[PDB]
Amino acid sequence: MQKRAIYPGTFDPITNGHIDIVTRATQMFDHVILAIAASPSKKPMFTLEERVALAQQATAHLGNVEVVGFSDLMANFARNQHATVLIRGLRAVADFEYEMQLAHMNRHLMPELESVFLMPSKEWSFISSSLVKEVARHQGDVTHFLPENVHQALMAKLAV
Amino acid sequence: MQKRAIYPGTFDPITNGHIDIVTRATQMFDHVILAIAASPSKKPMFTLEERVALAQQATAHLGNVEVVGFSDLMANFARNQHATVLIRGLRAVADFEYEMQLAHMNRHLMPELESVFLMPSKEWSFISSSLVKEVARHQGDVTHFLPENVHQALMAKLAV
Amino acid sequence: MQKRAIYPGTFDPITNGHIDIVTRATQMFDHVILAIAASPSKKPMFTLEERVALAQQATAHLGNVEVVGFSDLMANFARNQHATVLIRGLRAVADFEYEMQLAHMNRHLMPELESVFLMPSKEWSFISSSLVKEVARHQGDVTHFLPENVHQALMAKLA
Amino acid sequence: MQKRAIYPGTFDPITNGHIDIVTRATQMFDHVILAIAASPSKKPMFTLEERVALAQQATAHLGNVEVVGFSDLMANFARNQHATVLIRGLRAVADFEYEMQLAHMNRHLMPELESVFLMPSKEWSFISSSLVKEVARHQGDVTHFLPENVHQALMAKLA
Amino acid sequence: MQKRAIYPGTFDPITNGHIDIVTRATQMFDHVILAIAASPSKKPMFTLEERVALAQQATAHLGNVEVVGFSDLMANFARNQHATVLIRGLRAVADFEYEMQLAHMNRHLMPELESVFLMPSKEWSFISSSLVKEVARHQGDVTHFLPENVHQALMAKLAV
Amino acid sequence: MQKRAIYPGTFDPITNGHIDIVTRATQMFDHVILAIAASPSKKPMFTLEERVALAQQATAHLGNVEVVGFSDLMANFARNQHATVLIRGLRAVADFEYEMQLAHMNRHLMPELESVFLMPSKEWSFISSSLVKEVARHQGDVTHFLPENVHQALMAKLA
Ligand SMILES: Nc1ncnc2c1ncn2[C@@H]1O[C@H](COP(=O)(O)OP(=O)(O)OP(=O)(O)O)[C@@H](O)[C@H]1O
Ligand SMILES: Nc1ncnc2c1ncn2[C@@H]1O[C@H](COP(=O)(O)OP(=O)(O)OP(=O)(O)O)[C@@H](O)[C@H]1O
Ligand SMILES: Nc1ncnc2c1ncn2[C@@H]1O[C@H](COP(=O)(O)OP(=O)(O)OP(=O)(O)O)[C@@H](O)[C@H]1O
Ligand SMILES: Nc1ncnc2c1ncn2[C@@H]1O[C@H](COP(=O)(O)OP(=O)(O)OP(=O)(O)O)[C@@H](O)[C@H]1O
Ligand SMILES: Nc1ncnc2c1ncn2[C@@H]1O[C@H](COP(=O)(O)OP(=O)(O)OP(=O)(O)O)[C@@H](O)[C@H]1O
Ligand SMILES: Nc1ncnc2c1ncn2[C@@H]1O[C@H](COP(=O)(O)OP(=O)(O)OP(=O)(O)O)[C@@H](O)[C@H]1O
Ligand SMILES: CC1=Nc2nc(N[C@H](CC#N)c3cccc(Cl)c3)nn2C(=O)C1
Ligand SMILES: CC1=Nc2nc(N[C@H](CC#N)c3cccc(Cl)c3)nn2C(=O)C1
Ligand SMILES: CC1=Nc2nc(N[C@H](CC#N)c3cccc(Cl)c3)nn2C(=O)C1
Ligand SMILES: CC1=Nc2nc(N[C@H](CC#N)c3cccc(Cl)c3)nn2C(=O)C1
Ligand SMILES: CC1=Nc2nc(N[C@H](CC#N)c3cccc(Cl)c3)nn2C(=O)C1
Ligand SMILES: CC1=Nc2nc(N[C@H](CC#N)c3cccc(Cl)c3)nn2C(=O)C1
Ligand SMILES: [Mg+2]
Ligand SMILES: [Mg+2]
Ligand SMILES: [Mg+2]
Ligand SMILES: [Mg+2]
Ligand SMILES: [Mg+2]
Ligand SMILES: [Mg+2]
């Protein structure tokens, strides 16, 4: 089987938790599309061009990952990319109820698309991009949670 | 016993999940008031006049339902309507903690009003008006989750 | 409109939390059947005959309650009692998850039987028959959580 | 890319919910090992030989499934089956909490074995082998939840 | 041991639930700093000066409480106050997942600071400042949940 | 200010997660009593005398810890130890729900005894004595989760 999977999200910014999930996905599937939402409901800290560049640099060492921006329904994107697996990261702090709503709705929209839940290292099980951004805005040390390029970009963003 | 019950909410828009709960309520209580919030904290997609007309058309086949708009505390509304039962729908994806907060506060405000939790069909256990609206805004098929009149109204709203 | 509800459980023994739920049910429905499961699988402390007698005495002040024992499938028992409402009490999330499985299975077995969930007073939101028995087994005071007749029966059983 | 997955459990007996999960697994991976635990600690209704025969008949229509019994540590069994994916099914929050503990322990024992969680159809989201057995023990109809061969075996065991 | 603890939050306004938690904290620790967030993400109903005055009057009977405003990371505040305990109130309706995220992040920022979770009376286990404010805005009786000074201040605020 | 805390449990056997919690407690309070329940109802693997000896050796490096066994109601034991704090560890939501019931009951029995909940390191957030015993029963490596003395005792018990 030549399996194609999508890993959708806002990635605002990509963290070590997201890196852990996409790395695990690359070990089980032939091709992984890290799919970045162009226009989320909440205005992102980083623009789409910034989010894409940061994710590309942070996943450049993974040969079977492609980073792509999208603005449509994640099921419509998977359909157009010929993907049959949608990857979701399940943290210790996940909103399990929302993950159930999302998976059942995604199955209604594209029944041939299977939702696959992967668990990150215990190291990243208790973080989110929102939490990292709030800590960094309040002058806290978040270096451990980010790839080096993201740490540099976040410092630059908060400086101005 | 001549029991009167209220079923409050925003109904923005009314879905098949809400229809399932109000239908179950009509089988156990003599009179059910489907109570639509006039001024919710978050600006609704549909105006109160639209939400009321849609709920009336979608419940017209139920002889013991009355659709009414309200702007006061739901306990104050129940009190003025001589209702002694407040219906809440409990989904598989419900925020059980919030339902507990709400029921205990409603009991403090009107101790003679009993909160009754009803469970929808498995078919509607994983949806919400918010999720349906987000899917439809992103050009997804939500026909299965709505009464026909609501499907028509939602298409018209998103077209403009 | 001649509405009959059934409130099933093990009631080993009946607590003030169960009394709170059955009282709320009697204010809503014309007739409430408090249905006590023989429940041998849970190895109960009190026999079914003891549990029925204790619940009858504890609910004697409520005119529209009838206490009965059963070993049947609960949906068949509700049908045979001409009940169209099955009452369950919700204390917390642990109750909610299992109560969803049970209610969907009861719906499959009897679609016209509606499960209705009620919430107890904050006073009894954190108690169970198991917790009360564990405290009493270790000689802790449980008079606050039980009807008088039940407390004296529990003390006698452990004596 | 010659991907092998293991789907371990007690399967006492295998239900339509388990069939839903193993079917989803076969559409994703080249070969799926449905691994039935001897599980004497849970005092199962069916012997391991019975559970293996029932699951083999219930999954015979799926060409890339292999049913096997085991008493080993599940991470050692996955290694010995050359599996790099361990499939688990998630019905609700109760599953999620325990499944996190299990997956972190399996990762400690075999880091290259990835736990993959799948969600069943809404149809089977509220069932378990325990619930089905409890309904059948009380003579309730469970034909909707089990493969035909399993339903007839369950009726025979309780007869 | 001469222990110093902080009890941080928005306290918008302080309720009987917060009073219950700070009272329990004063019984176990030598000094408790009730720490009020100056600039929360969401605009508060009461200004910082109002929140501080209300908390001071409501805790004046507790000899070992100090009320202080802060705008920095709660871990940075604890560090500067020489506090080694951070008090969190855990309601029946708490977002346990968020409490786990927060405690693990606080431990990353200041490992010598221990998070201590205290449980309020059953009486206040189902309320929040948000719920109290929503009920009061909709003309509901919230007197039972507040200290007298807060009840007076809330009536004045909603009148204008 | 001469503050005494009690940390009660079954500790069958004591794990690195329990050691993490008792260590955090010793940094907060002047004296900590690690209280081991005889707990015959849970049919423990180790006798109470074994559990006390293992915990004493595992906590010998902490100067303000005292290990003791008890069969009493835990609130009565805290009173008799002159403790005003009862320490409990929180790993996840499953702990939280039951810990709320327990803490409200302990408050009813001894209002001046304050329950204090502590969270372990992420390293031990997903372990329990039951999980460690299940892995060891299936010959899986549990050296990472236990003090050296406890690991050797567990291997000997299963041998
Ligand atoms: N620390 C993490 N560990 C594992 N999975 C994660 C982690 N952070 C995010 N994910 C998952 O990755 C996907 C994309 O996440 P997303 O871009 O929304 O980041 P996020 O941290 O969830 O964002 P936000 O905090 O703004 O809600 C989702 O499946 C999400 O659950
Ligand atoms: N799918 C559904 N099944 C059962 N009950 C439902 C369903 N949707 C809503 N309810 C219940 O009906 C009542 C009114 O709901 P409301 O108008 O807020 O819709 P909603 O889907 O909860 O809205 P939103 O998604 O905007 O929060 C509440 O008791 C709610 O829990
Ligand atoms: N304190 C309580 N408040 C509200 N509902 C309750 C309470 N105790 C029990 N119930 C509910 O009453 C029904 C019958 O409960 P049951 O006989 O199992 O008692 P229980 O307290 O849960 O006993 P056990 O601890 O033995 O399981 C169930 O729906 C249960 O959730
Ligand atoms: N209805 C179902 N839908 C999805 N996954 C399921 C379902 N039933 C079981 N599973 C999952 O399949 C795996 C094996 O389950 P197992 O053999 O324990 O069956 P079970 O139904 O949970 O039985 P029991 O009730 O005896 O514990 C687990 O990951 C479990 O969560
Ligand atoms: N009723 C209460 N009982 C116990 N702890 C509480 C209560 N209300 C708040 N707390 C706790 O006190 C601290 C400060 O709370 P905060 O100022 O955010 O009030 P809040 O009620 O949580 O606010 P909001 O409703 O705006 O989110 C937190 O640890 C919080 O969990
Ligand atoms: N890994 C851990 N991290 C934090 N707290 C823990 C951990 N293990 C146990 N605790 C807590 O320590 C106390 C005593 O626990 P107990 O002796 O029951 O151990 P346990 O690991 O839960 O054992 P069992 O699996 O046998 O129930 C409880 O408050 C429990 O929640
Ligand atoms: C069942 C659903 N399918 C969905 N697809 C999208 N797509 C948008 C595309 C853009 N920008 C999006 C926005 C934010 C994050 C992500 Cl990952 C994706 N949203 N959406 C839902 O809310 C529900
Ligand atoms: C204990 C509570 N009682 C309450 N009553 C109301 N009423 C408003 C009326 C309007 N518009 C409302 C707004 C949105 C949805 C609904 Cl269902 C009702 N809100 N409210 C609370 O937030 C809490
Ligand atoms: C869908 C279900 N229907 C069911 N009916 C019964 N009946 C027994 C009767 C006896 N003894 C019982 C046992 C314990 C408590 C109660 Cl309330 C009822 N059990 N059961 C289930 O477990 C599931
Ligand atoms: C991290 C773990 N690894 C484990 N391996 C096994 N193996 C037994 C084999 C037998 N009988 C088993 C028993 C019941 C169900 C299953 Cl799926 C597997 N148990 N176990 C754990 O409890 C934890
Ligand atoms: C790990 C974290 N540490 C944090 N410290 C702060 N401090 C601000 C200070 C101000 N204004 C604050 C805002 C609102 C309530 C409180 Cl209690 C504290 N926020 N914050 C996080 O969001 C996460
Ligand atoms: C409010 C409660 N108080 C309680 N005290 C005890 N004591 C026994 C003593 C023995 N053996 C025990 C058993 C197992 C673990 C512990 Cl930590 C303590 N149990 N108990 C409850 O179950 C509830
Ligand atoms: Mg996110
Ligand atoms: Mg809603
Ligand atoms: Mg029970
Ligand atoms: Mg199972
Ligand atoms: Mg708050
Ligand atoms: Mg334990």
Tab-separated table of C-alpha atoms in Angstrom, chain B residues 122 126, chain C residues 97-109, chain D residues 7 12-21 89-92 94-95 119-135 141-147 150 154:
chain	number	residue	atom	x	y	z
B	122	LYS	CA	-26.596	8.444	18.399
B	126	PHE	CA	-21.649	14.456	17.915
C	97	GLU	CA	-20.047	8.001	30.437
C	98	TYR	CA	-21.554	4.702	31.681
C	99	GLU	CA	-25.076	6.264	31.807
C	100	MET	CA	-24.753	7.094	28.054
C	101	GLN	CA	-23.905	3.435	27.206
C	102	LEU	CA	-26.748	2.195	29.378
C	103	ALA	CA	-29.282	4.673	27.972
C	104	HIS	CA	-28.390	3.850	24.327
C	105	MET	CA	-28.725	0.112	25.079
C	106	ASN	CA	-32.057	0.646	26.901
C	107	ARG	CA	-33.250	2.667	23.857
C	108	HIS	CA	-32.311	-0.210	21.525
C	109	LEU	CA	-34.332	-2.630	23.744
D	7	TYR	CA	-4.806	-5.261	17.245
D	12	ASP	CA	-14.690	-11.977	24.970
D	13	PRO	CA	-16.575	-12.180	22.616
D	14	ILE	CA	-15.668	-10.216	19.485
D	15	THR	CA	-18.411	-7.608	18.756
D	16	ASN	CA	-19.394	-5.511	15.708
D	17	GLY	CA	-17.389	-2.664	17.327
D	18	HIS	CA	-14.190	-4.778	17.218
D	19	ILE	CA	-15.048	-5.820	13.602
D	20	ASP	CA	-15.456	-2.130	12.676
D	21	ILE	CA	-11.958	-1.310	14.106
D	89	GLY	CA	-10.097	1.555	19.572
D	90	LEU	CA	-11.474	4.679	21.304
D	91	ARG	CA	-15.192	4.760	22.227
D	92	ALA	CA	-15.109	7.553	24.933
D	94	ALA	CA	-12.827	6.228	29.907
D	95	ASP	CA	-10.972	4.509	27.024
D	119	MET	CA	-12.730	5.624	16.331
D	120	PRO	CA	-15.630	3.250	15.519
D	121	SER	CA	-18.871	4.119	13.699
D	122	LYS	CA	-21.398	6.035	15.873
D	123	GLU	CA	-23.411	2.723	15.660
D	124	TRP	CA	-20.917	0.895	17.944
D	125	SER	CA	-19.595	3.853	19.973
D	126	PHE	CA	-21.558	2.855	23.090
D	127	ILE	CA	-21.025	-0.909	23.244
D	128	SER	CA	-18.558	-3.261	24.985
D	129	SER	CA	-18.267	-7.069	25.305
D	130	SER	CA	-19.197	-6.642	29.051
D	131	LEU	CA	-22.405	-4.685	28.264
D	132	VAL	CA	-23.456	-7.184	25.547
D	133	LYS	CA	-22.864	-10.120	27.966
D	134	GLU	CA	-24.893	-8.386	30.747
D	135	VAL	CA	-27.858	-7.797	28.393
D	141	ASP	CA	-31.712	-9.219	22.393
D	142	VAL	CA	-28.073	-8.615	21.293
D	143	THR	CA	-28.320	-9.876	17.646
D	144	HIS	CA	-27.664	-6.304	16.395
D	145	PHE	CA	-24.231	-6.087	18.101
D	146	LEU	CA	-22.588	-9.372	17.187
D	147	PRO	CA	-21.545	-11.313	14.085
D	150	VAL	CA	-20.731	-15.075	17.793
D	154	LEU	CA	-23.139	-16.587	23.175
